[PDB]
């Protein structure tokens, strides 16, 4: 099936399409290929929850109905996470 | 006053992307369940699907009679009309109407086309290759001249008509400019003679699907490649629709065809929708909230916003005229999704109806509106 991804940190968000059997390594490779820098220094957060990198997205809880293009769930990102995983600080959107 | 039309089937409706012109047709009379009431001769029920409304006008000129089952196209907003079955039988005259004019009343014109004409018949398919119109198939009387193709008589028409009819697979090129009939040699396995078959135009590829050979109603798919005149039978992989008739193969994109409805041999009207991909070569079934409304002999046309709009049809069977109960509903099937103009339109109609509710609305860039408004300043008054 088809699972679509929000990646939100520090007034930057990243829209990225993937499949259900894709691991967290493959989306790490594609965000490395977008933003032109090391992807191993980043941490993902399912509302402040670290995922295992070898886990496929069927096991991660990101399905197609949960992460509909027109209504999708998010992860936050934290570069330089390394050991001191960057604390998540998502600046949200403005008031309507 | 919203001009609600009479419920009908057999009308021809054409689409430029902005207007379906609905003309002709017949209905079952609800007062008198004895004879099918043909619709009035001059009635044009133009439904704008971009501005979603009805406007009926009256025409003049060399007016053709009350047609139910004709074959009409609309090329550069010009109506061309051929064939059909009026209340005394079938015809094979050619008629032309100009729909570009809005200042004057619309005047019909009969054109006697040079070349060999086909027989008086109806229920045939058209494909439009630039200024040429290829006519294929149909049901009707015997061909008077030496006509390429195979004519096979329906036996039961012998038990219901003073002159018997039958199906054919006869192709004819009519020119739109010079009004010339011609009839080229085709190649490949030509398909079966059939009626209520589906025609669809991509390029010089014309797809015919479905119909009722003999008394059986199937689901075979053929295409004519009009630059090469080559007939090819194409059986798509994956899941497939059932055998049906009276279905309109209206295209929605250059790779993707849309099919609404159907009518099986058991005389059941179908309420399912299908899409077809040429490049994957696959039928796949569409889910839609109009599964409670089966329609046959309807008009499913294509809009510029990627919506297939259906007007007409009957909710039950059309064979017995007393059992016919026609419908005049407008059905929307957006396989290609709605646009930002249309998502703004469901943003207003659901979430601003009870809402009366920040005071900051400036403007910087000019002239970015010219595909949106149209007739804007005369509205509402």
């Amino acid at each position: 099936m088809d699972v679509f991804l929000m990646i939100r940190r520090h007034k930057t968000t990243i829209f990225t399409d993937a499949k259900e059997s894709s691991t967290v390594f493959e989306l790490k490779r594609i965000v490395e290929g977008i933003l032109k820098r090391p992807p191993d220094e980043q941490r993902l957060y399912k509302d402040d929850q670290l995922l295992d990198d070898g886990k496929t997205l069927g096991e991660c809880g990101f399905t197609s109905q949960t992460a509909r293009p027109q209504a999708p769930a998010t992860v936050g990102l934290a570069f330089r996470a390394d050991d001191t995983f960057e604390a998540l600080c998502i600046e949200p959107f403005s008031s309507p | 006053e919203l001009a609600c039309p009479a419920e009908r089937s057999g009308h021809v409706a054409v689409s430029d992307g902005r207007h379906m012109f609905v003309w002709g047709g017949y209905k079952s009379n609800q007062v008198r369940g004895l004879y099918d009431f043909y619709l009035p001769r001059e009635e044009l029920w133009i439904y704008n699907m971009e501005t979603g409304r009805w406007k009926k006008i009256n025409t003049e000129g060399d007016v053709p009679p009350s047609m139910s089952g004709s074959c009409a196209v609309c090329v550069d907003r010009v109506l061309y009309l051929f064939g059909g079955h009026h209340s005394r039988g079938n015809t094979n005259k050619f008629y032309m109407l100009d729909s570009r004019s809005t200042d004057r009343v619309l005047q019909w014109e009969r054109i006697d086309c040079q070349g060999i004409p086909p027989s008086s018949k109806d229920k045939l398919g058209v494909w439009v290759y630039k200024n040429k119109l290829i006519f294929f198939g149909g049901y009707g009387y015997l061909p008077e001249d030496k006509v390429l193709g195979t004519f096979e008589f329906d036996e039961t028409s012998f038990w219901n008509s003073s002159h018997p009819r039958g199906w054919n697979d006869h192709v004819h090129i009519l020119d739109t400019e010079t009004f010339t009939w011609s009839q080229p040699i085709t190649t490949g396995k030509a398909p079966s003679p059939r009626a209520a078959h589906a025609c669809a135009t991509v390029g010089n590829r014309g797809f015919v699907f479905g119909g009722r050979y003999r008394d059986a109603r199937m689901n075979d798919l053929h295409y004519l490649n009009l630059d090469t005149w080559e007939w090819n039978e194409l059986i798509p992989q994956g899941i497939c629709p059932v055998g049906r008739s009276w279905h309109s193969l209206t295209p929605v994109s250059s790779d993707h065809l849309f099919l609404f409805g159907g009518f099986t041999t058991d005389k059941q009207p179908l309420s399912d929708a299908w899409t077809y991909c040429i490049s994957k070569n696959e039928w796949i079934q569409f889910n839609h909230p109009y599964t409670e409304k089966p329609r046959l002999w309807h008009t499913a046309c294509a809009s510029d916003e990627g919506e297939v709009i259906v007007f007409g049809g009957c909710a039950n069977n059309l064979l017995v005229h007393h059992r016919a109960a026609h419908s005049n509903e407008i059905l929307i099937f957006s396989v290609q999704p709605k646009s930002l103009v249309r998502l703004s339109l469901e943003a207003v109609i659901c979430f601003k109806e009870m809402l009366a509710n920040w005071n900051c609305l400036p403007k910087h860039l000019l002239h970015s509106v010219n595909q949106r408004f149209g007739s804007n300043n005369t509205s509402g008054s």
Partner: protein
């Protein structure tokens, strides 16, 4: 392949280009592959987020026989959605 966009309140954004080929105002504004650096002064980030989300949806639900769902519009962002439709014309 991925193009940068700035909202009114300074929110940076990065765009799939084949998801960005649909709207004509941005394709006449940027490049009118190639990564562009463009900016907005008036339209906020929440109604813009919907725009790009809409595009992905628009791209995913093009030419398939899946059930195309209705999109929920909140009534507080619907006035800015009609504003964004006026200032985009997609």
């Amino acid at each position: 392949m991925y193009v940068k966009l700035i909202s009114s309140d300074g929110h940076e954004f990065i765009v799939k280009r084949e998801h960005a080929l649909t709207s004509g105002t941005i394709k006449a504004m940027l490049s009118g592959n190639e990564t562009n650096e463009v900016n907005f002064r008036e339209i906020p980030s929440h109604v813009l987020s919907k725009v790009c989300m809409y595009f992905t949806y628009k791209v995913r639900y093009t030419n398939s026989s899946t059930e195309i769902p209705e999109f929920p519009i909140a009534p507080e962002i619907a006035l800015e959605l009609l504003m964004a439709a006026n200032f985009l014309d997609c």
